[PDB]
Amino acid sequence: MQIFVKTLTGKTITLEVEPSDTIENVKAKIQDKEGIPPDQQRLIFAGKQLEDGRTLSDYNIQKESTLHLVLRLRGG
Residues in contact with 32: Cβ distance below 8 Å, sequence separation at least 6, in sequence order: none
Query: Residue 3's closest CA among 20, 23, 18?
Result: 18
Radius of gyration, alpha carbons of the chain? 11
**How far is it, in rounded angstroms, from Cα 57 to Cα 35?**
25
Asked if 17 and 33 count as a contact pair (C-beta separation under 8 A), the reply is no
Q: Which domains does the chain have, with CATH numbers?
A: 1-76 (3.10.20.90)
Task: For 14-45, give one letter per residue: b (16+ CB within 10 A) or e.
Answer: ebebebebbbeebbebbbeeeeeebeebbbbb
